[PDB]
Amino acid sequence: LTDLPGVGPSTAEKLVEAGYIDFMKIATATVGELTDIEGISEKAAAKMIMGARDLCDLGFKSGIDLLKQRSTVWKLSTSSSELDSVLGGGLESQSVTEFAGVFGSGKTQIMHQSCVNLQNPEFLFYDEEAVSKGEVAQPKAVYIDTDGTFRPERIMQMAEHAGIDGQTVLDNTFVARAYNSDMQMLFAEKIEDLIQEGNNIKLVVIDSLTSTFRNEYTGRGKLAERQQKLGRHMATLNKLADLFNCVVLVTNQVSAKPMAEQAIGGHIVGHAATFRFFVRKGKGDKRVAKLYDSPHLPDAEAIFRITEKGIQD
Ligand SMILES: Nc1ncnc2c1ncn2[C@@H]1O[C@H](COP(=O)(O)OP(=O)(O)NP(=O)(O)O)[C@@H](O)[C@H]1O
Ligand SMILES: [K+]
Ligand SMILES: [K+]
Ligand SMILES: [Mg+2]
Ligand SMILES: [Mg+2]
């Protein structure tokens, strides 16, 4: 931390206690939140930010560099051949991909299946030139359980059918039961602490994402307040995926209001989610994921199934 211009081991011991220990946390901070710290002046704060953006090389980039930045984004397999395809390879890190859909369409299954596929190194697709082996070594997931539907059994079950060891997944997956939007938001904010303690968090799950905000901000004369609180949440979730190069998955419910339906969460959720899906039930265990929004990929459908082994085909 003293590598930073104008940073005595004091101002450093201070920054660590205030949470800022990473050059990025500091490079992407504001001169206001940084001065909120004691002996940290304005020029002191202004200087270490400029210095960290610098050390981290956050300037203008052109040509081949645009490709090298893009190559830093690894991807997680959904165990579905078709879903990965439609996903442009798999679930991307540095982005928030959402799965919305009717009850029992498999949203939760996808969240569990992921926590498992993370513990299998051959399910993390990356370019060894931009993503080192150590950067994805001993990955860990973080399952923020909103509905109260996390199921250890299911994690164990999906683990064997894939050769993986069940306890091994449970030992590397942190679960946080949130009973309201408050606990929900705060848990997501406290993922930074899990990292500061050496946990290679490479997967974040919010299931469900909107349930809480709706039960709380009922009156739609309160919806302004909601969309506001809900916008900072999505912001935190994205900075996370960006800064810790991990994938952020979230599930969402569908509103009756008119395809036919639409994911709840309002505008803010739409703008904030990078990849948006609509999952449907088919005959028996046949399911369909429909990609309707993304920045570079074309809308498309993926067929898979939900069996005792999890997601397959
Ligand atoms: N062990 C299992 N073997 C086979 N199928 C299973 C198993 N466990 C769950 N399922 C299937 O998973 C389906 C439900 O998927 P699930 O992801 O839990 O719903 P959801 O998408 O989260 N819907 P919702 O709760 O409304 O948000 C069930 O109805 C079962 O057919
Ligand atoms: K249900
Ligand atoms: K539910
Ligand atoms: Mg991003
Ligand atoms: Mg569910």
Curated annotation (Swiss-Prot):
Coiled coil location: none
Pfam family, one: Rad51
Cystines in this chain: none
GO molecular function, one term: ATP-dependent DNA damage sensor activity
SMART domains hit by this protein: AAA (SM00382), HhH1 (SM00278)
UniProtKB keywords: ATP-binding, DNA damage, DNA recombination, DNA-binding, Nucleotide-binding
Keyword Acetylation part of the UniProt annotation: no
Annotated CDD domains: archRadA
Binding positions for ATP per the UniProt entry: 101-108
The keyword ATP-binding belongs to this UniProt entry's keyword annotation: yes
Example GO BP: DNA recombination
Function: Involved in DNA repair and in homologous recombination. Binds and assemble on single-stranded DNA to form a nucleoprotein filament. Hydrolyzes ATP in a ssDNA-dependent manner and promotes DNA strand exchange between homologous DNA molecules.
Sequence similarity: Belongs to the eukaryotic RecA-like protein family.
NCBIfam families, per the entry: PRK04301.1, recomb_radA
Name by which UniProt lists this protein: DNA repair and recombination protein RadA
